[PDB]
Amino acid sequence: MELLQVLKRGLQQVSGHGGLRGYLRVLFRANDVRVGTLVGEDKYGNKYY
Amino acid sequence: SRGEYVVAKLDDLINWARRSSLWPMTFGLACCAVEMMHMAAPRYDMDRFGVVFRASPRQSDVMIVAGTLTNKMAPALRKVYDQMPEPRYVVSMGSCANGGGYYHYSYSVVRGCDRIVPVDIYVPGCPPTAEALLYGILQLQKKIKREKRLRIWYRR
Amino acid sequence: MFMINVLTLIIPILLAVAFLTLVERKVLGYMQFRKGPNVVGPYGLLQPIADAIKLFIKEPLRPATSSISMFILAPILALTLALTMWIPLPMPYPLINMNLGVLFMLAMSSLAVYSILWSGWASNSKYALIGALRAVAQTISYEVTLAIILLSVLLMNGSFTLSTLIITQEQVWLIFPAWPLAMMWFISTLAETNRAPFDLTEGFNVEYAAGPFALFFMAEYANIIMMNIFTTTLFLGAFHNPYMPELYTINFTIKSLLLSITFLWIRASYPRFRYDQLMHLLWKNFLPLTLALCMWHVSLPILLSSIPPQT
Amino acid sequence: ASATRLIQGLRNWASGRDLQAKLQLRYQEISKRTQPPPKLPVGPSHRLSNNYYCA
Amino acid sequence: SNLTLNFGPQGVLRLVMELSGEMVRKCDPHIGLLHRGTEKLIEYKTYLQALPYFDRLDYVSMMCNEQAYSLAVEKLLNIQPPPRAQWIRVLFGEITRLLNHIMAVTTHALDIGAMTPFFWMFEEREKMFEFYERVSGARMHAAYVRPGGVHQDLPLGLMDDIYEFSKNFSLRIDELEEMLTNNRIWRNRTVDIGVVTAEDALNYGFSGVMLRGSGIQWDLRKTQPYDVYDQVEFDVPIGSRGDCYDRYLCRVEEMRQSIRIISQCLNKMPPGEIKVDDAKVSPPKRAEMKTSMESLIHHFKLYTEGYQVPPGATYTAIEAPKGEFGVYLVSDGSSRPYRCKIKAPGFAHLAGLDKMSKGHMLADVVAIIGTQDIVFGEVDR
Amino acid sequence: VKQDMPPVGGYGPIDYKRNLPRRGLSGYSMFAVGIGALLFGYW
Amino acid sequence: TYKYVNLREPSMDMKSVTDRAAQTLLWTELIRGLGMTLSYLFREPATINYPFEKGPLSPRFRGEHALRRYPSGEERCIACKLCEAVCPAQAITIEAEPRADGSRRTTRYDIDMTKCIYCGFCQEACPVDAIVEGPNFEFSTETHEELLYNKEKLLNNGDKWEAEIAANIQADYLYR
Ligand SMILES: CCCCCCCCCCCCCCCCCC(=O)OC[C@H](COP(=O)([O-])OCC[N+](C)(C)C)OC(=O)CCCCCCCCCCCCCCCCC
Ligand SMILES: CCCCCCCCCCCCCCCCCC(=O)OC[C@H](COP(=O)(O)OCCN)OC(=O)CCCCCCCCCCCCCCCCC
Ligand SMILES: CCCCCCCCCCCCCCCCCC(=O)OC[C@H](COP(=O)(O)OCCN)OC(=O)CCCCCCCCCCCCCCCCC
Ligand SMILES: CCCCCCCCCCCCCCCCCC(=O)OC[C@H](COP(=O)(O)OCCN)OC(=O)CCCCCCCCCCCCCCCCC
Ligand code: SF4
Ligand code: SF4
Ligand code: SF4
């Protein structure tokens, strides 16, 4: 069954933002919770994925 | 004081509800209407911001003037603006709505829609991109966010 | 105690109507290759609250009205009839269990046109009165096939009891012997509530302020959810274990939500009928088949010796 | 391209067409945003002889 | 007595209806609400300066009107574009045709009530505006097709993306056509609606689909061909009944044939320059502006004075997606036009609106204003 | 010269025709299925 | 070279007549339209997450104006007035004089951004690449006169945006 891999990907998106705290942080600031490769960060704190 | 804190939280609540539920009345005058329709299109998608697509003028929150305002239609613009209930806002979009634009020296063009209606947000471009119009709408939402109606009411 | 039961009926009606607007904007988002509201709340869950507070502190539109009485009584009648259509609905047990709940709902749905007529005359606009008269004529048109299809199905029920309609469908859905009645019933309830492709009022209450217009809107969505629950009970009626009523409650809830999503999925698919085209649809297409199937569903329990029980 | 094969099969049945062959969302098959630099050609009048403007 | 309504400006259009109940006895379109005096402002500006006005006439058919004005000026200059510029003009003219017919069909469905293929096809329209932004820098008003050719060569990798778009776009046409063509509600809104006879269509100055929906076999890309339309292979859809449904089918089939032309233009793009190699008309390259003396003088004089066009009058008409788009350009020998009349098809179509809406109803008026693809920028100038 | 050109083998063939896939049952079969569902419901 | 849309005659055998009557009574093409809308329900939408995600642009993009400098701090503009001569909107107003070291420089360089039509004739007329129409499109203002740029605003736009403008000109100047 491939619903299980969908649930696993959602749970490791929860795991990838540093737990539930960072998950809710990016959920309420971004309205999107998907994880990505950190490409960079400028001299202000903007992070680029 | 306590009442200052209460009216500050009430201003935050009513500003949240007025900026997160903006209903636009879009004047489809000229080419800027096409890019408003791209701002409503599935890529940029105004509706996910709470900004609905083509509400009626008698219940809209913001008049988007999108296109050239001619002399023949300036009273119709002011009449539709007067039919809007308060708080009403006006976004000027593109160069002809902003200052007359490419038809600034024309005999039959109102040189900027701020000779007719009070304008809150000036979005520049010819046409401004749908992403740029959406930037202007979010700057309008931030302007609504820092309103102080009940704080000034408690201080008056 | 009974007042607690009335409040636990009528408050989640208003909550489900509040979130039907969110579900509608999300489903018509994703069916139109876009997203619905997802910024205002977490996944957009605060969009109905923000919408309601926006509508309730807006400036009143300040109309010049032909009447005060009908201009105030049309939202009151709309909301009262929208809330009182829920009391005989078996879910598995109704609030007001009555012998004639089907005829009760048919009568209280026939009374809903006075909100449209009073709100159309209580505006000074002649175009609003024309749109209101066209909406009233549409609604009284499709009430005919509502009544006759409803009668034909209750010829298989045995009585006007809505709780007997769960006993009637214990071996089979009643969409199987009555699927032409079911599809004409579905389009007829679609045309009752001025729902697309029958929404000529979006292509009659333009003088109300944002608050009372939200009240008309929420009465209309209470009617939509209610007619979907009534269609669910009447054609897709679920299994009912009397020792665990949550089985039937979960089952008719899932079917009613799928049927309301089917309303949302029909309004995202079709252009509007012109007015004489849906008058042609009722009086010349739905009504002859409805009469012929009414004759068939009279004569069929007699010719099969399947006359249902009176009690 | 991220949909599971159950949703992908439901989607191809509901549309009736093979939608993964022709997806309206763009992916890695597009051109690179950084390109090698061009060398545009000169026209026919870039000549050092027999190139009078009166002809 | 009979009813008289004023569907006002609350593009934009004022309509004065004389109705007899449900019927329509008289339809008077009051226009001029987007009259900006374009073709008086053209008279004080040079030919290059008057070029971006043509982007804003039919503001869903930008590079087509650029092409018509460029063909008018190049006809008066007695010069011709290079072949690669001609294939680029025909390529982006057919991409513009896809833009205009998506706008036409999806707004004609939006006004009737089918609001969903609007959102489905504006993503494809968003991708074609990305093609415009990649080729010129602006998403709508490119100022790209110029007298002499085009402004700038195609960036590398643009034709591969036009291939990847054109490969998938026929399925988008197919799902639009799945939603609307066999739909009984769409047919009931468009079959008996606005039947135009061929003789009255020739008499009223109709052009394009407004002729070809009525069975007239006329397309200016075939009969009076311009840049390389005699070298591409395509078919011209012809209607049978002159109604809104045949004009809908003609626009869907013109999207099909535009995809055919775009495939042929991608497979037949020649190498070479993109401006005319007369540096007294088209400006030189910036590498040779900054090295050659003649090229710096020609850069200076073209971007301040402009080229002098010889005195003469021309009517250059192309097949824009709305029909015959014409420019009557009168040059007095200076570097500014003396006169520029802009013939646009929507003006004559909206003039024929009154005959097309006789005996119909009020909700058929929006279908007839949809079947004439009316952009009021080209109507009011 | 390095210019935006099609590749040497050309581009791939491009669909431009109608493909309405003609799905569903026959009309005889659809009336048969509907009347059979009626017969099951009546029984 | 032409094709007849909508010139098909329907068949009149009992098979096709029953097919059309089944299509009438059983609403088959309406179910086809519902199936297409249901197909798009289960697709990924095309919606990007603005402001956190941006629409794709090219290096040719014509946004907000800026005045560039040479790589010595000297400004490129030498007051030749080609850009206000070619400006189709007459949005540019230039006044000049020799400054204290004798250099041909401007004292006034104004661009009314509300008159501007954003067509980029000024950057392609400029013989020294001084005025450019850079990448910025997010410069909406709350006031009309904030969109009336003088020379100081355009030089601050150049100093703000040079790190991106020079890379776009590097990526694009071989097509020019
Ligand atoms: C309750 C759960 C859901 C139930 C099903 C509903 C969900 C499906 C909804 C799909 C989308 C619908 C959107 C709105 C559509 C409105 C338009 C429309 O459909 O108009 C109706 C159309 C109108 O016709 P028309 O306009 O398409 O065709 C032209 C009509 N004339 C010629 C008059 C111009 O069809 C009907 O009226 C048919 C109604 C249903 C008929 C059921 C018949 C069953 C079979 C009986 C036997 C027949 C064989 C012969 C005798 C044999 C005896 C042994
Ligand atoms: C004596 C002390 C108490 C005084 C009375 C107050 C009682 C409590 C009233 C409710 C809460 C008041 C505070 C409201 C929020 C204030 C802070 C705020 O505005 O935060 C903004 C934040 C969203 O941030 P934003 O700027 O939108 O960022 C976008 C991200 N891209 O916003 C969010 O994250 C979400 C904001 C949600 C706001 C609260 C929920 C709405 C109100 C619910 C109750 C009233 C309505 C009840 C139902 C009405 C009918 C349906
Ligand atoms: C039958 C059940 C029916 C249920 C109906 C409702 C369904 C949805 C419920 C809500 C779901 C979760 C919503 C969370 C909203 C976001 C909360 C939040 O964090 O808001 C932030 C905002 C500003 O916080 P700040 O101090 O700025 O913090 C920044 C830190 N650097 O701070 C604030 O805004 C202040 C806190 C406001 C909290 C409001 C929460 C939502 C209230 C909705 C009303 C209905 C509640 C349910 C009632 C029925 C069930 C009991
Ligand atoms: C313009 C003014 C304001 C408008 C808004 C308010 C009015 C409109 C909306 C409300 C409509 C109220 C309808 C009242 C009667 C409904 C019909 C009814 O009672 O039927 C149910 C039932 C018959 O079923 P049965 O099973 O036989 O009875 C139990 C015996 N085992 O019968 C019973 O169980 C009988 C129960 C006792 C009798 C109930 C009578 C209620 C009071 C009289 C009507 C009040 C409203 C008057 C105005 C109506 C609208 C103009
Ligand atoms: S500012 Fe320009 S592109 Fe925009 S509507 Fe005006 S003329 Fe058209
Ligand atoms: S972009 Fe065009 S309108 Fe704007 S300042 Fe430059 S030349 Fe003038
Ligand atoms: S910006 Fe360029 S074109 Fe304009 S005056 Fe300065 S140097 Fe000349």
Swiss-Prot record, chain C:
EC number: 7.1.1.2
Subcellular location: Mitochondrion inner membrane
InterPro entries, per the entry: NADH_UbQ_OxRdtase_su1/FPO (IPR001694), NADH_UbQ_OxRdtase_su1_CS (IPR018086)
Entry's transmembrane regions: 2-22, 68-88, 100-120, 147-167, 172-192, 210-230, 246-266, 287-307
This protein's UniProt keywords: Electron transport, Membrane, Mitochondrion, Mitochondrion inner membrane, NAD, Respiratory chain, Translocase, Transmembrane, Transmembrane helix, Transport, Ubiquinone
Protein name: NADH-ubiquinone oxidoreductase chain 1
Chief place where the protein resides: mitochondrion
Originating species: Ovis aries (Sheep)
Catalysis: reaction(s): a ubiquinone + NADH + 5 H(+)(in) = a ubiquinol + NAD(+) + 4 H(+)(out)
